[PDB]
């Protein structure tokens, strides 16, 4: 009975309407739909044992009909926000059984969900980020396919001309994945760190997703510290050869790497690091030099410097020291 009304209101929200010559009836309909959604958000959030098997296709269908749309070059956000909200509470519910939902949340669904990441609305990409993070976490049989399709988006962003507004949100999800990796890093993961994450520093629009990219690179080094050398050497490779404020970005990422670096791995790249660091101190741009000089306010770096002053000091101040 109450299950029947749930399905009714769900299907009721599958009706897209428009009144070209009746703005008053249009507001009534949008209010009814907004109300029904809010009622269902409150319903599945604070009630237990309400998510029965027959409603699973009803929810996924309601989400698909509303969200899987053809993106413009939104305005109806009060409705879209509720749909995202409702679907999230649905996924996060303790009554949620992925073994039943895997029938309806498949690869095509995940694929269409990723299309929406190209949205220009920061609010929407945030909901999508959370939603895809839930699906990856509760659907073990989708994890492999999701990583594959995200890897494709990056490859088309770096190499191909395909720009993407959701690069940051995707990296934020990836950081959540990397942090929970197994003990020995799979070869595909190491390749991903090197063939994908590092060339992401090459793209011109780095400013948008660099904080998220830096976190991913750091998390990779927190797992396997064997990867510290090819990462650092790559950052020095992709380093802005021309003195520009973009160096501040790299200096920030480079200090965050040094915070979690192994002393034995530090010495493997301490020379080409401080050669570049010396150039930054000598930069015509004050902001770059100011940022590089801030390295000395880091206690752990000092320990690495002091215990390696025989190799570092000649590079930083060649006027005062010799090798």
């Amino acid at each position: 009975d109450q299950e029947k009304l749930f399905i009714q209101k769900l299907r009721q929200c599958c009706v897209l309407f428009d009144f070209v010559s009746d703005p008053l009836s249009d507001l009534k309909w949008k209010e009814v739909k907004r109300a029904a959604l809010s009622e269902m958000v409150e319903y599945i959030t604070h009630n237990r044992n309400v998510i029965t098997e027959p409603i699973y296709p009803e929810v996924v269908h309601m989400f698909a009909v509303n969200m899987f749309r053809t993106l413009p070059p939104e305005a109806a956000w009060p409705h879209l926000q509720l749909v995202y909200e409702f679907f999230l509470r649905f996924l996060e519910s303790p009554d949620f059984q992925p073994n039943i939902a895997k029938k309806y949340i498949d690869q095509k669904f995940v694929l269409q969900l990723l299309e929406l990441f190209d949205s220009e609305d920061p609010r929407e990409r945030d909901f999508l980020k959370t939603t895809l993070h839930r699906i990856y976490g509760k659907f073990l049989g989708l994890r492999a396919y999701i990583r594959k399709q995200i890897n494709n988006i990056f490859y088309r962003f770096i190499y191909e001309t395909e720009h993407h507004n959701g690069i940051a949100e995707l990296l934020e999800i990836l950081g959540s994945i990397i942090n929970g990796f197994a003990l020995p890093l799979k070869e595909e993961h190491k390749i991903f760190l090197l063939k994908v994450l590092l060339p992401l520093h090459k793209v011109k629009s780095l400013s948008v997703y660099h904080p998220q990219l830096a976190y991913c690179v750091v998390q990779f080094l927190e797992k396997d510290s064997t990867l510290t050398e090819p990462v650092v050497m790559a950052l020095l490779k992709y380093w802005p050869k021309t003195h520009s404020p973009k160096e501040v970005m790299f200096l920030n990422e480079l200090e965050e790497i040094l915070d979690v670096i192994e002393p034995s791995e530090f010495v493997k790249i301490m020379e080409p690091l401080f050669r570049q660091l010396a150039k930054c101190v000598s930069s015509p741009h004050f902001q770059v030099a100011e940022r590089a000089l801030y390295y000395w306010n880091n206690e752990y770096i000092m320990s690495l410097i002091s215990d390696n002053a025989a190799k570092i000091l000649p590079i930083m101040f060649p006027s005062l020291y010799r090798n």
């Binding site: 934020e172 959540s176 929970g180």
Partner: peptide, 11 residues
């Protein structure tokens, strides 16, 4: 509110 870690598994 940063996303909670997702522990890698086998399936």
């Amino acid at each position: 509110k940063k996303l909670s870690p997702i522990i890698e598994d086998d399936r």
